[PDB]
């Protein structure tokens, strides 16, 4: 019954509109939902704008007059030029006359800010269409109207604020480069008169609401105005002195001064420097007297959230970091500026103590800027010794566990602070370690944080000073473990003792006995049931293996064998209580050491001794599960097989090409097992349906295949002898994985088969011509059919499919030349099918294949296949690219769409296509492709964008084609075309911008 206002054949019920609106805003439930589908339908009515002058004049609901302006905004934006010239001045006068009426009624000017701000913006949308060519008196009349009322002058500051935003801050995406440059020029020519009004209102007072609205417009001007309006007047004196005392203006003034710290400044003029130092001096002075002193606990102020404190401190952090990162050199030479420089940094020290992660990351980026400057620039580091002294404690007490990026930044700052003063950093770290021992600052969180800071500064002190330091820490950390009582409290300390020693490999590589002791104790912790200690031992083990692996392969003095052999002899007893994932990490760590042995047959001997257990378990299951293959339904047998394989993947990951003999030891039975596991996966689906693919029995079976392929992918990606890969590995692999994939149901096809074929082609593709040709025969058509129905089903197969087609196009492109002509068409359909994906992991890959496919056709020269390609698929690739470029649903890939289209256009204006693109009858003979292209495109754009005049399509195509060599301009021409197709009446002269 509320759907009556949708009938435009009658008149509009204003009072019913106010009911429908309030039912949507103040209402709830199903009546609110229905009220919305009406208000939306009312708004989307293409003739609804004709009723906006009733609502704005007669309605009493401010939310109705808002939606009226929303309909006007749409009309002014998209169809303003399709209007008869009469309406354009009725709307302009109605909006101007309305805004004037609201500044007179202080009840409206005060209690209806939303409707006024919306009105001012709708006024700006008109200025974007009519000003100044059809409204030159706007700015002068705006200034005369500002002296006749406080409410008008204040609101005029709102119009200019929105105007400057729409012209300089948000015009790149929304208007053409011609229309954008037009309004930028128009505002610059009339800004001297605007600044006069602004500076007068700032100096003459007195209404705070008018002052703030004026300051808010100044913030927008500092984005683009010439520097003389800031430095050649007296306005910096007012921003830094007068407006920092009142909290109403303090927030915006600080944001303005934050911008002024980033203007265009000739750093040769000695007077602007005094201005840049003066406003910083005044600002820090008003903060010290009118807000809070430099010794105030800002961590506590922020934590109390009184009023606007958390934003002032936010903005004060931005101001100081912005200014000092660009102007602190002005303060470092003069001795009368030394205290101003230091007080400024002392405020930052206080802010750096605030518990606010995003605020901390801000100030940390400045500390990074400073300590890197004190590490390189001469004579500067002594100015900040007291600043750096406190900074060390600030960072040592907020060291995060190694966001992964916050730690690297904290370590980098902390490493710089150690180079500037080793003695001070030791005293801070040892005294904090002492305060952990007396129990004052003792906590799990606080001992870990201290342990991370100590571990982060390794390799910055001399090997002698570091030696003395690590021992002092190890001593105090052990004494802390005898102190505390309870496995929990002792495991916390004992774990930090291992993180520290894992961080000092330089220390470990000079002391074998201590290093040997640490590894053996790590082994003992691998039998420790306490949660987090086995993973602590396994992580620290491989962590130290990575940096000290030489000391495990060479024969250390006073030892009878290299320690790698001793780890192998007891590996079963060492890895007995660890989880299967922890065993794989242990085996991976050993592979890191075995790779150091460059004696070949000695490295092979270690590999066989390391792989001893998984090989004996391998030969056992190879025999007892080949006759009869019943065990593959037993879960325990499947789990052993997966762990045997995952152990091979672990070692192959760290040994790479040095893994080939162990891979050969199992290769022919592993592929046989890959077959036998495939037989039951298919036998189970034929017995239980497609639901079996979800059952753990098949999920475990499909795991064996997923890991078998992963072991082969790992070695080939890292192999050095590519010949053996081709003549030993590729042959049985394809005859084991391809037919199984092809003749399986789509729900039983492992997507890693495509990934494994991608790595095979990536390494040895250029050596396997018929291999790639055979890979396509088994995986192309059947996978394409799995994904050519929607952008959703089988997402993993979708990504690996286009990865594989991409590398085939890069490496063995001749494999597509040997495709049947009907199958090559599906190949083209698949590439364009990738353009339409919103999934960027497919969209970018498809755009790349098209770009490389075109180049692959250009290299063939003037041959029949290349000519038949342009005859068939050239204009398809052009139109498909234009579609995804203009449908506003693939905006993430605009750059590669522009690049691919530019390559297609350039191919014609350089005569790189031999045959004519057209049929012999449809155009006169002798017509160049350059002309038929500008006709095919003109016809195509007219049928897809009938609201464009024939003169827009001409000027666009003219500019676009003659710019196919300048990508930055070409891209800009597309952006102008995209803007013009959202509206009617676009200027065809806008394509002459370049």
């Amino acid at each position: 019954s509320m759907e009556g206002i949708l009938d435009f054949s009658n008149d509009l019920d204003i009072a019913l509109l106010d009911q429908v609106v309030s039912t949507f805003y103040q209402g709830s439930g199903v009546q609110q939902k229905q009220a919305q589908e009406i208000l939306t339908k009312f708004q989307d009515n293409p003739d609804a704008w004709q009723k906006a002058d009733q609502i704005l004049q007669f309605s009493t609901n401010p939310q109705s007059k808002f939606i009226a302006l929303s309909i006007l905004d749409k009309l002014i934006t998209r169809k303003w030029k399709l209007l008869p010239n009469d309406h354009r001045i009725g709307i302009r006068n109605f909006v101007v006359g309305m805004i004037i009426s609201m500044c007179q009624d202080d009840e409206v000017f005060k209690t209806q800010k939303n409707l006024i701000n919306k009105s001012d913006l709708t006024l700006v949308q008109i200025l974007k269409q009519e000003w100044p060519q059809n409204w030159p008196e706007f700015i002068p009349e705006l200034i005369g109207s500002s002296s006749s009322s406080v409410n008008v002058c204040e609101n005029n500051m709102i119009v200019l604020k929105l105007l400057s935003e729409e012209v300089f801050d948000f015009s790149a995406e929304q208007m053409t480069q011609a229309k954008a440059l037009h309004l930028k020029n128009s505002m610059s020519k009339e800004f001297e008169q605007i600044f006069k009004l602004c500076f007068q209102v700032l100096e003459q007072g007195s209404s705070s609401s008018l002052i703030v609205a004026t300051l808010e417009s100044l913030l927008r001007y500092l984005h683009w105005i010439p520097y003389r309006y800031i430095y050649e007047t007296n306005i910096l004196e007012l921003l830094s002195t007068k407006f920092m005392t009142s909290p109403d203006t303090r927030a915006i003034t600080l944001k303005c001064l934050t911008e002024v710290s980033n203007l265009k400044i000739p750093q040769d003029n000695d007077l602007i420097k005094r201005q840049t130092v003066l406003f910083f001096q005044n600002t820090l002075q008003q903060i010290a007297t009118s807000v809070m002193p430099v010794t105030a606990d800002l961590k506590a102020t922020y934590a109390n959230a009184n009023g606007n404190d958390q934003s002032f401190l936010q903005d004060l952090a931005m101001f100081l970091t912005t200014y000092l990162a660009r102007n602190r050199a002005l303060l470092e030479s003069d001795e009368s500026l030394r205290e101003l420089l230091l007080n400024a940094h002392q405020y930052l020290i206080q802010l750096s103590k605030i518990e606010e992660r995003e605020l901390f990351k801000t100030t940390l980026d400045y500390w990074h800027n400073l300590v890197a400057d004190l590490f390189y620039e001469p004579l500067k580091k002594h100015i900040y010794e007291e600043i750096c002294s406190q900074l060390r404690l600030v960072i040592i007490e907020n060291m995060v566990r190694p966001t992964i990026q916050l730690y690297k930044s904290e370590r980098e700052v902390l490493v710089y602070l150690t180079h500037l003063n080793v003695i001070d950093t030791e005293e801070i770290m040892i005294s904090k370690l002492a305060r952990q021992i007396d129990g004052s600052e003792w906590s799990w969180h606080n001992i870990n944080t201290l342990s991370w800071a100590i571990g982060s500064i390794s390799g910055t002190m001399s090997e002698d000073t570091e030696k003395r330091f690590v021992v002092t820490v190890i001593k105090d950390l052990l004494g802390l473990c005898e102190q505390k009582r309870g496995k929990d409290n002792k495991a916390v300390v004992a774990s930090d003792i291992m993180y520290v020693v894992g961080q000092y490999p330089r220390f470990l590589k000079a002391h074998w006995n201590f290093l040997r002791t640490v590894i053996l104790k790590l082994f003992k912790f691998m039998h420790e049931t306490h949660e987090g200690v086995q993973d602590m031992a396994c992580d620290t083990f491989i962590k130290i293996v990575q940096k000290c692996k030489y000391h495990f392969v060479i024969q250390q003095p006073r030892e009878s064998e290299p320690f790698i052999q001793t780890i192998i002899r007891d590996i079963q007893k060492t890895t007995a209580d660890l989880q299967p994932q922890q065993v794989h990490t242990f085996y991976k760590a050993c592979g890191i050491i075995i790779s150091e042995e460059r004696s070949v047959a000695e490295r092979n001997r270690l590999l066989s001794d390391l792989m001893q257990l998984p090989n004996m378990a391998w030969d056992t299951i190879v025999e007892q599960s080949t006759a009869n293959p019943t065990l593959l339904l037993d879960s325990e047998t499947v789990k052993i097989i997966a762990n045997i394989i995952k152990t091979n993947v672990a070692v192959c990951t760290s040994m790479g090409a040095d893994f080939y003999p162990q891979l050969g030891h199992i290769y022919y039975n592993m592929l046989q097992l890959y077959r036998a596991v495939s037989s039951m996966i298919s036998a189970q689906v034929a017995a239980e349906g497609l639901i079996a693919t979800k059952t753990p029995k098949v999920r475990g079976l499909r795991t064996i295949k997923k890991e078998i392929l992963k072991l082969v992918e790992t070695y080939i990606s890292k192999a050095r002898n590519l010949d053996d890969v081709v003549k030993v590995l590729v042959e049985p692999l394809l005859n084991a994985v391809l037919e199984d994939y092809m003749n399986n149901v789509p729900d039983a096809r492992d997507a890693e088969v495509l990934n494994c074929m991608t790595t095979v082609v990536e390494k040895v593709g250029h050596m396997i011509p018929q291999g790639v040709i055979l890979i396509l025969q088994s995986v192309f058509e059947c996978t394409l059919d799995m994904i050519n129905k929607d952008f959703t089903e089988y997402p993993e197969h979708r990504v690996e499919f286009y990865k594989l087609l991409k590398v085939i196009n890069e490496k063995s492109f001749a494999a597509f030349l040997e495709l049947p002509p009907a199958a090559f068409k599906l190949f083209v359909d698949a590439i364009c099918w990738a353009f339409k994906h919103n999934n960027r992991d497919v969209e970018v890959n498809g755009l790349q294949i098209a770009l490389d496919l075109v180049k692959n056709i250009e290299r063939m020269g003037n041959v029949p296949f290349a000519n038949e390609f342009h005859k068939n698929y050239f204009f398809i690739f052009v139109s498909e690219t234009f579609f995804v470029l203009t449908d506003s649903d693939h905006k993430s890939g605009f750059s590669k769409q522009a690049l691919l289209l530019m390559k297609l256009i350039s191919l014609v204006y350089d005569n790189k296509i031999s045959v004519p693109l057209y049929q012999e009858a449809e155009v006169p003979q002798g017509t160049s492709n350059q002309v038929y292209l500008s006709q095919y495109l003109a016809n195509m754009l007219s049928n897809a964008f009938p609201h464009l005049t024939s003169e827009q399509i001409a000027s666009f195509l003219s500019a676009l084609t003659k710019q196919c060599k300048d990508l930055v301009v070409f891209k800009g021409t597309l952006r102008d075309f995209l803007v013009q197709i959202k509206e009617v009446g676009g200027d065809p002269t806008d394509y002459l911008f370049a």
Binding site: K487, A491, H511
Partner: peptide
């Protein structure tokens, strides 16, 4: 360090 190696070798978190 031979003495430090024994402080950590003996270290018991079960006490």
């Amino acid at each position: 360090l031979n003495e430090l190696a024994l402080k950590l070798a003996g270290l018991d978190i079960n006490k």
